[PDB]
Antibody, heavy 224, light 211 residues
Framework: QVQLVQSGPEAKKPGASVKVSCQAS????????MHWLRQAPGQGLEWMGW????????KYAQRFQGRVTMTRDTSISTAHMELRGLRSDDTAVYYC?????????????????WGQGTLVTVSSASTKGPSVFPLAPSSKSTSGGTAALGCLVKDYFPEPVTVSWNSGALTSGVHTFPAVLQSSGLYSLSSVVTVPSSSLGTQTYICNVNHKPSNTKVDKKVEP | DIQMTQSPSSLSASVGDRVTITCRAS??????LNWYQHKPGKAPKLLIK???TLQSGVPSRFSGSGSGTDFTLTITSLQPEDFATFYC?????????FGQGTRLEIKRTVAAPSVFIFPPSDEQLKSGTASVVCLLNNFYPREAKVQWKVDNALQSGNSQESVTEQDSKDSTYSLSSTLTLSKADYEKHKVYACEVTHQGLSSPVTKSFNR
């Protein structure tokens, strides 16, 4: 029934603004308050404000009142939020949530339905496309006949990149690692998949890396 | 102004075990507290409203109690689809505040890491950089220490490591530590070794190559 679909991930320079959106489906959009929240990395959730979609009236947190604006577009059932004056503190995953008790007989604020989250990265680094390098298999056989091969996605900005193996026809035994921010300001991750060593050379393995902010999609085959 | 403190910071438990986590409010909030389940990458799910009432669709193993300042959330017969980071949230007075979180981990039999090491690609060496990659595969628990040594001289301040989320099938972890050098630094040495210290590992395993 009810699902809240948010905007895709964005990356802004320090000092600029970001407009994160959140689209409601499955219920009358007017008559339920839309709260906006955020989660700093490894810090838990912060509440920012709520918006009445019937009136457009808002109440922001006192920390955010000069900087944030929550607006509605009632006919497409989309809630917007515009946070200005972005600092490196403002790098967070941003969530919209429905207050159920502004449409029922309770007095709390219960977030029964949330959005999927929007990663907003605030950094001074410009957008740079990834370089993809193979992690070739060798005499690497633990567990008997069990080889490991991989793909290194190094020096890209911003997050995310999506990696898949053989157009998504290899999901078993694959570990895609979280990206690590470097001293250069650029992200790097690695994606590995374990396969039997008997299948080395009989089966060809290609990792499909796609970086949507830079419009980069490269397919490279990893060979021993 | 209502600080919310949860205890403990992180805990590990097995499937079927009963565990309780506490949530403390800085001031009086009577029953205006909600419990949320939060798996990484996905949306939070409301579990307990009004500090004791179960949300629709939430299974019967979840239970909550408490009023005033001290609140508890109890899961009785733990299931692999319940392991997440849990938050408590006050709704009495604005601003709305949350707890810091409580990571819930799956206890399992202790598993040794499969150690793989990766020389830098020739395509990267023509670009003038070199990244040597060590892979630790399918281990428990999460704590494992990786040390790079080249020609029995251990490195420091030039290696970055990342660990995966806990797997959903075997409840294991995977770690990748990446040592980064220049091309002139890479072609200057012979032995490139990766030492692993893990709890399910008797002697520290050293995996190496000579290119």
């Amino acid at each position: 029934q009810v699902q809240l679909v948010q905007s895709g991930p964005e990356a802004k320079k320090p000092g600029a603004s970001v407009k994160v959106s959140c689209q409601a489906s499955g219920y009358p959009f007017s008559g339920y308050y839309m709260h906006w929240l955020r989660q700093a990395p490894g810090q838990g959730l912060e509440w920012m404000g709520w918006m009445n979609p019937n009136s457009g009236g808002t109440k922001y947190a006192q920390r955010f009142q000069g900087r944030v604006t929550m607006t509605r577009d009632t006919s497409i059932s989309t809630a917007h939020m515009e946070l200005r004056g972005l600092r490196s503190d403002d790098t967070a995953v941003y969530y919209c949530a429905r207050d159920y008790c502004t449409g029922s007989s309770c007095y709390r604020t219960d977030y029964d339905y949330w959005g999927q989250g929007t990663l907003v990265t605030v950094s001074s680094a410009s957008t740079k496309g990834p370089s993809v390098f193979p992690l070739a298999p060798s005499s690497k056989s633990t567990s008997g006949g069990t080889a490991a091969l991989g793909c290194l996605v190094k020096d890209y900005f911003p997050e995310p990149v999506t990696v898949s193996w053989n157009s998504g026809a290899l999901t078993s035994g694959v570990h895609t690692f979280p990206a690590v921010l470097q001293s250069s300001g650029l992200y790097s991750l690695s994606s590995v998949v374990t396969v039997p060593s008997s299948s080395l050379g009989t089966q060809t393995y290609i990792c499909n890396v796609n970086h949507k902010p830079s419009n980069t999609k490269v397919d490279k085959k990893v060979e021993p | 102004d209502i600080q919310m403190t949860q205890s403990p910071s992180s805990l590990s438990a097995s499937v079927g075990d009963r565990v309780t986590i506490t949530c403390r409010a800085s001031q009086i909030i009577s029953t205006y507290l909600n419990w949320y389940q939060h798996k990484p990458g996905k949306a939070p799910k409301l579990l307990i409203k009004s500090a004791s009432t179960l949300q629709s669709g939430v299974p019967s193993r979840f239970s909550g109690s408490g009023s005033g300042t001290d609140f508890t959330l109890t899961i009785t017969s733990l299931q692999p689809e319940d392991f997440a980071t849990f938050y408590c949230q006050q709704s009495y007075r604005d601003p709305i505040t949350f707890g810091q979180g409580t990571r819930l981990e799956i206890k399992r039999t202790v598993a040794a890491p499969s150690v793989f090491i990766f020389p830098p690609s020739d395509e990267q060496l023509k670009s003038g950089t070199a990244s040597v990659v060590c892979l630790l595969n399918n281990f428990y628990p999460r704590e494992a220490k990786v040390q790079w040594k080249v020609d029995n001289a251990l490195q420091s301040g030039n290696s970055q490591e990342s660990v995966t989320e806990q797997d959903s099938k075997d409840s294991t972890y995977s770690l990748s530590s990446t040592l980064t050098l220049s091309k002139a630094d890479y072609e200057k040495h012979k032995v490139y070794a990766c030492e692993v210290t893990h709890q399910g590992l008797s002697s520290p395993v050293t995996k190496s190559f000579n290119r």
